[PDB]
């Protein structure tokens, strides 16, 4: 549940993803992993279909943006309705084409997370503290919503 899109190679993105997945698994849920800057293949998109109930996106590096162009088209076909998109700031250095895509999240009105503004460029310990907390907090939305609220007596 909740597909975190990260990069195992470039920057701390993989370690940030670890903070998210482990923070939520430790609580007791289970987070999905997808490398937006490495393992971008049909196998990732296949999982995105079933796990489409929640997504998480970090920064948009130019080098990775070139590999996202194709998959992005397939994503637009899979995701719909009002699902979760954990957009978290972690590096002040994007690529211009990001804004046109942000306009989509804006207009379509998807469930966005805590929006920060330009964290220098290099992810710091603070970034981990935001990733874990905001990620878990987003998961707390998905769980209550998809558990049908009164579907579990307590």
Curated annotation (Swiss-Prot):
Superkingdom of the source species: Bacteria
Q: Residues in domain Flavodoxin-like?
A: 2-146
Presence of keyword Iron: yes
* UniProt KW keywords: Electron transport, Iron, Metal-binding, Oxidoreductase, Transport
Q: Is the keyword Lipid metabolism assigned to this protein?
A: no
Give the Gene Ontology MF terms in alphabetical order.
Answer: FMN binding; metal ion binding; oxidoreductase activity, acting on the CH-NH group of donors, NAD or NADP as acceptor
Q: What does this protein do?
A: Mediates electron transfer from NADH to oxygen, reducing it to water. This modular protein has 3 redox cofactors, in other organisms the same activity requires 2 or 3 proteins.
Please state which protein family the record places this protein in: In the N-terminal section; belongs to the zinc metallo-hydrolase group 3 family. In the C-terminal section; belongs to the flavodoxin reductase family.
Something else the entry says is: By homology with NorV in E.coli, could be involved in nitric oxide detoxification.
Q: How is this protein named in the record?
A: Putative diflavin flavoprotein A 3
What is the native source organism of this protein?
Nostoc sp. (strain PCC 7120 / SAG 25.82 / UTEX 2576)
């Amino acid at each position: 549940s909740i597909g975190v899109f990260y990069v195992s190679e470039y920057g701390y993105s993989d370690r940030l993803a670890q903070a998210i997945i482990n923070g939520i698994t430790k609580t007791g849920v289970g987070v999905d992993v997808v490398d937006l800057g490495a393992a971008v293949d049909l196998q990732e998109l296949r999982e995105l279909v079933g796990r489409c109930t929640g997504l998480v996106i970090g920064m948009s590096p130019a080098a990775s943006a070139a590999s996202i162009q194709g998959a992005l088209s397939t994503i637009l076909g899979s995701v719909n309705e009002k699902q979760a998109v954990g957009i978290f700031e972690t590096g002040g250095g994007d690529d211009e084409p990001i804004d046109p895509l942000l306009s989509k999240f804006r207009n379509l009105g998807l469930t966005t997370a805590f929006p920060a503004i330009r964290i220098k460029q290099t992810p710091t310990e603070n970034t981990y503290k935001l990733c874990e907390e905001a990620g878990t907090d987003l998961g707390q939305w998905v769980t209550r919503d998809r558990l049908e609220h009164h579907h579990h007596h307590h």
